[PDB]
C-alpha cells in the first residue's frame, strides 16, 4: 500500500464524474479538442490557408464557421506550436492552421482515453466490455477519415475541416473526385447505418407495443421497476406478430441485442476500409465495360454515364476556389456546360 | 443513489448561490464583450478586420505558399496592407 | 436551501436563453454576414 | 356458418402462417403486380426517354447494364403528371419507350406499402397488442411518398421522381442538391441526426444489454443459448448496465426504466426521419436550404468567400451539367 | 480595402466631369436597386435578356452612352434600346411608365442619382463578378 | 454537511466559465459593422 | 391515469372544462387572424405587389373583392383594417368565455342542463351536435354566395381587361358540372376539384354545399345511426377525434395542391405566379425576345430535334418547348388569347402579342416560386440580393407539414381508440395473453 495504490484509490472513488487512470488522458485531451474548436470557430480566420472567412468574429454563422485545415504548403507537418513553422508565435500558429492539428491530435488521444475509460469502468463494475468493442467503429472512422486519408494525399489541406458546411463540402468533393457513392465499401456502410436506425426504431416500437399491463395508469412507464425479475414485454407475442407480418421474427433476446451491436459497428468498419482506399485515389470510379461501349456507341446512355458528367461539372467548377494553391485559371470557354445553363 | 456532492437543485435555488453568481456571470459576459469591443480579439488571433483582407487595389488572396517561410510570408502580406 | 423557487429560476433562465439567441438571429440581418 | 362469414373468418384469421386481413386483400395484389413488373423491366425493358427529348436512357440488364447501373427509368417528361396506364398507349412498344412501367410500379407499390402499414395496425388488434408499430413504419413510408409522389407533384413531372435503381438514386441525390441545397436544409440535418443517432443508440443498447448478460452457459457454447424463447425472467442485469453507463457519463444521463429507454429508441429515429421526409416534401415546393452565397463582404464590398460559397461552386457544377440537352432557356425553374 | 472617395468617384456626363458620391448615397442606391431593379438585374446581369448587362464597358457602347450619371438618370426616365432607335418605356420600368410599373412611382430625383451611382461604382469593387453571371459566383 | 469545492465543482466551472465569456464576445460581435 | 405530458386527456369526461378548452382555443385562432392582418397591413406598401411583401391574409381578403380594383390594384386599405380589428376584438369574447368555462364554470355540464351536457356514447346526442354544426357550416358556405351575388362580388382574374371585381349573376347549378369535378381524375390535365377555373362554378358549388350541409344537419338532428353504422364504428370521444384528424389531414393535402396549382381562387396578381405559370412565362419571354430579333420561332429546331420554342404535346396540342413541355396544362389569363383550337396559334404569336403580355410574362418568370429558407429568391445557386419567397411556397409547405402530422395524429388516436374500446390499451394481461391460447404457426 504505497503511493501508487493510494493514487489508485483516489482515481477510482465513486463520485459524480468518475475519473480513473484513463481520466488522466481523456479529460485534458477532450477538453482541449473541444475548447480548440470553440476558440477557432469564434475567433480564427482561414484567410491565409484557404482564402475563407470561418469565425463568428468574421461574420460567419453556426453553419459556416469552421476550424479549417492547414495550407497545402505545410504538407503533413505536425504544426507544433514550438515547431519550425510557427516558431512559438501563437498568432502565426493560428493563421497557419495550427488549431487543426491541435484538435485532430488531441481528439485522437481523447478517443483513446474514452475507450480506455469504457474498459476501466467495465472492469470495476463487473460487466463484459462490449460497449468498448462497439466504440472501435467510431475510432476506425475518425482515424481513417481525419488521419489516414490526408496522409495518403498531398497534405492535411485535403482532410475534412471541422465545421458544418466544411463537412458538406467534403461530401461533395468525394462525389465529384472519387465517385464515392459508387464504392461498395461505402454502400456497406450505408446499409449498416440505415439498418441500425431501422433496428433501433423497430425494436423500440415493438417493446412499447407488446408491453404487459403491470399497472392501472394510462401512462405505462410507471409500471416498470428496475429490480423486477420479469420481462416487461411479451417476447412470445412480439415473435408471433412479426412472423405473421414479415415472415420471420427474432426468437432469441440475446441474438437480437448482439445483432444490434453487430449491424452499425460492421457498417462503419466497412466504410473506413473504403476511405483507406481513397487515401491512395484507389477509387471504384468507373466500370470499364460501360466506358468502352459508350465511347464507341454515342446512343448508349445509363445513369452511370449521367453521373460522371455531374462529377466533371463539380470538378471543373469548384476546383479553382477549393484548391487555391494550384492557381487554376479556367477560362469560360473550357468549363463543361450543357445547353443554356 | 448519491455520491455525496450537494444536489444541484438545492444549490441553484439557494440564496447564497445567487448572491455570488449574479455578480460572476455578468462580469464574465462583460469581460468577453470587452475582449471584442476593444479589438483585442483581432490582435491575439491574427484575424483580419473588415478593412484588411485585401489591399486597396488587390484581388489576390494572401495565400501561404511556403512551409518554412510561412511565418515571414504572412508578415510580408501584413506590411503590404499598412 | 430551497429559497428561490425552482420554477422561477427556470423561467428567468429560459428567457435569458431566448434573449441571447434572438440577438444572434437579429445579427444575421445586420452588420457582418448580412450580405449588405 | 354463412359463406360470407366463413370468408371473413379466414381473411382475419390469426392462424394463417402469414396474416392476410382486409388491408392484405388490397396489399397482396398490388405488391405482386409491382414486383412482377419491376423484375421483368429491370431485366429486359428497352431504353426510356425519361426527359422527353427523344434521348432514351438504357436501364435494364439485357441492354448493357449491371446491378449497380440498372434501373427502371422514370416516365417521359412529355407525360408530366398525366396518368399513363397501358391502355392509354397505342402499343406496348410505345408504352415502354415512354416509361410506362415506372408509373405502374410506383402506384402499385405506394398503395401496397400503405396497406402494409394498415396491416400492421390490424394484426396488432387481432392479437390484443398496443397499436402503434404502424406509426413507426409511417416514417419510411412517408419518405417513399416524398421521392416517388410528392416531389414529382411539386415539380410537375414523374420524370423527376427517384429512379428504381442504384445509380439512378445517386443521380436523383446529386441533382436534388444542385437545385435545393438540401445539405444546408435543417430538416435534412435533422434526418442525418435521426439516422446517425439511430445507428448510435442501436449500437449502444445492443452493447449494453450484451455487456450485462447473466452467466448461464460455458465458454464452449454460444451465450445465446442462455436465453430460451418465452422464459419469464429477464436475461440481463439492467441495474448492472445502468451502473456501468451511469458511471461512463454521469448517473442521471443513464436510463433505469426500460420502458422509457425503449420508447426513446423508438422515437429518436422515427421523428428524425419524419423531418427528413418532410424536407423532401417541402423542397418539392421549392422552399430550399439556407442560402449564404456572398453573405460575407469586406469594408470595400469585396466578397469574402466562406465554405458556403465553396458548396455553391460544387452545386453550380451539378446544375450546369445535369440533363445537358434538356434546357433551352437560362433558368431551370423546375 | 475600404470605400474610399476614389472608388466613389464616377463620371457625371460624357464631357468628362466627375462626381464623388458619399458612402450614404452608395448604400442608398444599393437598397433602391434591390427594391426596384434586382429581380431582373441581380449582380449586373439581365435575367430576361442576358445579352445585355450592366457592365460599364457595355453601358459605354450604348447609344446615348449610359456609362455616366446623366445617361443613367435619363435611361430611368425614358429607356431606349441599345442603339437608341426605339423607346421601351412600356416594357421596361421607368418614370415615364410608373403607372404600369408602380414601384417607380415614389422614386425622387436623388433616388435616381443614387441608383445610377450604385451601378457605376459596383464594377469597381466586384470586377468581373458584376455582369459576369454564374461563372464568377 | 456538504463540501463546496469538489471534482464536480471543477468540471462544472471548467465548462461554464469560458462559456459565458464566449457568449459575451459573440453578443458584441452582432454590432460589428463593415 | 394520465401523466402531465398527456394532461389534456384528463378533460375527456369533463364536458364543462373541455368546452372552455375548445372555446379558449377558438379565441387563439381568431386572435391570430386579427393580429396577423394588422401586422400585414402595418407593413403593407401598395406600390409593391402583395407577393413581394410576405402577405398571406390580405390576399385572402382581396380575393373576396374588398380593397382592390381593376388589375388587382389596391384602392382602399380600410376593409383590411376592419377585418383585422373585428377578428381581434372578437377573440376577447371567446377568450373570456373560454377561460370562464375552463376555470370557474361547472366542471361537467350534464348536471346543469340536459341540453348542453353529453355522453360520448350517446349516439343520438352526438349526431345532434353534429347536425347543429353542419347547419352552421352550411350557412357559412352561403355567406360566400351572398357576398358574390348580393354584396359586391368577387375578384375575377379572368375578367376581360386585366382582372376586376365582378358580381356573379349566373352561378352554375347544373350538377353535371358541379359533381363532374368530384369525378375528374386527379392526374395531369384533369386535376380533380383543383381545376375549377371560373367563379360561376365556384359560387355554384357553394350553393350546393350549403344546401347539402343544411339538409344533412336536419337529417342528423332527426335520426340516430343505423345498425350497420353502429357495428362499424368505435363510439368514444377519442375515436371521434381520430375521425376528424383524418378529415383535417385529407383537407390539408388538398389545400396544398390548391394553392400550388390553382390561379383562380388564388389569383397570381395576389399570390404570385404558380410553378407551372412561371415556367411557361420564361418560354414566352424568350419566344418574344427572339422573335423580335427576327427568329421564326415556329420553324426553329432545337438541339434535340424538338422545336426550340414550340412543339407538340403527346395529344398534338402546340405547346411551349424546352423542359416546360411538362407544364402545358397550365392555363392563365395572360396566355389564353394566344390559344386556338390546336393549341398555341402561330399567327397570333407572330402578330398579336401585346406589351401587357410581355410585361406579365417577364414579371412572372422573375417571380417564380423558388427561394431559400432565409428568403433569398431564385434557384439555390443564386447570390444574395433579392429578398423573396412566394406566398405559394409558404402556404404549400406549411400545410403539407400540418397535413402530414395530422395523418400521424389520426393513426395514433385511431389505433388507441380501438385498443381502449377493446380493453388492452394499457398492455397485455399476463394471466390471459391471447397468443398463449392460440396454436403455434409451425
Ligand atoms: C488505430 C490506432 C489508434 C491510435 C491513433 C493515435 C494517433 C497517434 C498520432 C499519429 C501520428 C501520425 C503522424 C505521422 C505524420 C506523417 O506520416 O507525416 C508524413 C511524413 C512524410 O512527409 C511527407 O513526405 C512526402 C514525400 O517526401 C519525399 O518525396 C519528395 C518528392 O521527391 C522529396 O524528395 C522530399 O524530400 C522527400 O522527403 C511529401 O514531401 C509531404 O509533403 C511530406 O509531408 O512521414 C513521416 O512523418 C513519418 C512517416 C513514415 C512513418 C510512417 C508512420 C505511419 C503513419 C502513417 C501510416 C498510414 C500511412 C497512410 C498511407 C495511406
Ligand atoms: C378515403 C381514402 C382516400 C384514398 C383515395 C385513393 C386514391 C387517391 C388518389 C391520390 C393520388 C393523386 C396524386 C395527385 C397527382 C397530381 O397531379 O395531384 C395534383 C392534383 C392537381 O392536379 C393538377 O391540377 C391542375 C389544375 O390546374 C388547371 O386549372 C387551374 C385553374 O385555375 C389553373 O388554370 C392551372 O394553370 C391549370 O393547369 C392541372 O390539371 C395539372 O395538370 C394537374 O397536375 O391535385 C389533386 O387532385 C388534389 C388532391 C391530391 C392530394 C394527393 C396528395 C397525396 C398526399 C399523400 C400523403 C402522403 C401520405 C403519407 C403516408 C405516410
Ligand atoms: C431559443 C429558442 C427560442 C425560440 C424557439 C423557436 C424555435 C423554432 C423557431 C426558430 C426561431 C428562430 C428564428 C426566428 C426569427 C425568424 O424567423 O426571422 C425571420 C422573420 C423576420 O425576419 C424577416 O424575414 C423576412 C422573410 O422574408 C419575407 O419578407 C420579405 C420582405 O417582405 C419578402 O416578402 C419575402 O418574400 C418573405 O418571405 C425578410 O427576410 C425580412 O427582411 C426579415 O426581417 O420572422 C418570421 O418571418 C417569423 C416567422 C414565424 C412564423 C412561422 C411561420 C413559418 C411557417 C412556414 C414554415 C413552413 C415549414 C417549412 C419547413 C421548412
Ligand atoms: C390551447 C392550449 C390549451 C388549452 C386551452 C388547455 C386547457 C386546459 N388544460 Mg391543458 N395543457 C396544454 C394546453 C392547453 N390546455 C399543454 C400544452 C400542456 C402541456 C404542458 C397542458 C397540460 C395540462 C395538464 C397537465 C392539465 C391541463 C388541464 C387543463 C384544463 C384546466 C387547467 C387549469 O385549471 O389550470 C389552472 C391554471 C391557472 C389558474 C393559472 C392561470 C391560467 C389562466 C387561464 C391564463 C390565461 C391568461 C389569459 C391572458 C386570460 C385572458 C383573460 C381575458 C380574456 C379576460 C383546461 C381546460 C388540467 C385538467 O385536465 O384538469 C382536469 C390538467 O391537469 N393541461
Ligand atoms: C360554442 C360555445 C359555447 C357553448 C356550447 C356554451 C354553453 C354554455 N354556456 Mg358559455 N360562453 C361562450 C360560449 C359557449 N357557451 C362564450 C363565447 C362566452 C363569453 C361570452 C360564454 C360565457 C358564458 C357565461 C358567462 C356563462 C355561460 C354559461 C353557459 C351554459 C348555459 C348558457 C345558456 O343557457 O345560454 C342560453 C343561450 C343564450 C343566452 C343565447 C343568446 C344568443 C346568443 C348569444 C347568439 C349567439 C351568436 C351566434 C350564434 C354566433 C356568434 C356570432 C359571432 C360568430 C360573430 C352552457 C353550458 C353559463 C353557465 O355555465 O352557468 C353556470 C354562464 O354563466 N357561458
Ligand atoms: C361532417 C360531416 C358528416 C359526418 C361526420 C357524418 C357522419 C355520419 N353520417 Mg352523415 N351526412 C352528412 C354529413 C356528415 N355525416 C351530410 C351533409 C349529409 C347529407 C348528404 C349526410 C347524409 C347521411 C345519410 C343519408 C346517412 C348518414 C350516416 C352517417 C353515419 C355513417 C357514415 C358512414 O358510414 O360513412 C362512411 C361512408 C360510406 C360507407 C360510403 C362512402 C362513399 C364515399 C362517397 C366514397 C368517396 C371517398 C373518396 C375516397 C374520397 C374522394 C371523394 C369522392 C366522392 C370523389 C355517421 C354518423 C348514415 C346514418 O347512420 O344516418 C342515420 C346514413 O345512412 N349521413
Ligand atoms: C385537433 C387536434 C388534436 C387534439 C385535440 C389532440 C388531443 C390529444 N392528444 Mg393528440 N395529436 C395530434 C392532434 C391532436 N391531439 C397530432 C396531429 C398528433 C401527431 C403529432 C398527435 C399525437 C399525440 C400523441 C403521441 C399523444 C397525443 C395525446 C393526446 C391527448 C393529450 C394531449 C396533451 O395533453 O398534450 C400536451 C401537450 C404537450 C405535451 C406539448 C406538445 C408540444 C409540441 C409537440 C411542440 C410543438 C411546437 C411547435 C412546432 C412550434 C415550435 C415553436 C417553439 C417556440 C416551441 C389529447 C386527447 C396523448 C394521448 O394518447 O392521450 C390519450 C399522446 O400520448 N397526441
Ligand atoms: C425586368 C422586368 C427588369 C426590371 C425590373 C429592370 N430591368 Fe433594366 N432591363 C431589362 C431588360 C429586358 C433590358 C434590355 C432592354 C432592351 O431590350 O434593350 C434592360 C436594360 C437595362 C439597361 C441598359 C443596359 C445596357 O445598355 O447595357 C439599364 C441601364 C437598365 N435596364 C437599368 C435598370 C434599372 C436602373 C432598373 C431598376 C429601376 C431596372 N433596369 C429594372 C429588364 C429589367
Ligand atoms: C485552444 C487553446 C487552448 C484552450 C482553450 C480552451 C480550453 C477553450 C475553451 C473554450 C470554451 C469552453 C468555450 C465555450 C463556448 C461555448 C459557447 C459559445 C456555447 C454556446 C451555446 C449556445 C449558443 C447554446 C444555446 C442553446 C440553443 C441555441 C438552443 C437550445 C438551448 C441552448 C441553451 C442549448 C489553450 C489555452 C490550451 C492554448 C492553446 C490553444
Ligand atoms: C385555459 C388554459 C390555458 C389557455 C388559455 C387561453 C388560450 C386563453 C385565451 C385567451 C384569449 C384568446 C385572449 C384574448 C385577448 C384579447 C384581447 C384582450 C384583445 C384586446 C384588443 C384590443 C384592446 C385592441 C385594441 C386596438 C384597437 C381596437 C384598434 C387597433 C389598435 C389596437 C390593437 C390597439 C393555458 C394554456 C394558458 C393554461 C391552462 C388553462
Ligand atoms: C364547393 C365547390 C365545389 C363543390 C364541391 C362538392 C360538391 C364537394 C362534395 C364532396 C363530397 C360529396 C365528398 C365526399 C366525401 C366522402 C368521403 C371522404 C368518404 C369517406 C369514407 C370513409 C372514411 C369510410 C371509411 C370506412 C370504410 C371504407 C369501411 C367501413 C368502415 C369505415 C366507415 C371506417 C366545386 C368543386 C364544384 C367547385 C369549387 C367549390
Ligand atoms: O433538375 Mn433541373 O430542374 Ca428538376 O427539371 Mn429542370 O432540370 Mn430536369 O427533369 Mn429531371 O431535372
Ligand atoms: Cl442528369
Ligand atoms: Cl428549358
Ligand atoms: Fe432491448
Author numbering:
A (entry chain D): 12 to 352
B (entry chain E): 3 to 84
C (entry chain J): 5 to 40
D (entry chain A): 11 to 344
E (entry chain V): 1 to 137
F (entry chain F): 12 to 45
G (entry chain C): 32 to 473
What do the study's own words say?
In natural photosynthesis, the light-driven splitting of water into electrons, protons and molecular oxygen forms the first step of the solar-to-chemical energy conversion process. The reaction takes place in photosystem II, where the Mn4CaO5 cluster first stores four oxidizing equivalents, the S0 to S4 intermediate states in the Kok cycle, sequentially generated by photochemical charge separations in the reaction center and then catalyzes the O–O bond formation chemistry. Here, we report room temperature snapshots by serial femtosecond X-ray crystallography to provide structural insights into the final reaction step of Kok’s photosynthetic water oxidation cycle, the S3→[S4]→S0 transition where O2 is formed and Kok’s water oxidation clock is reset. Our data reveal a complex sequence of events, which occur over micro- to milliseconds, comprising changes at the Mn4CaO5 cluster, its ligands and water pathways as well as controlled proton release through the hydrogen-bonding network of the Cl1 channel.
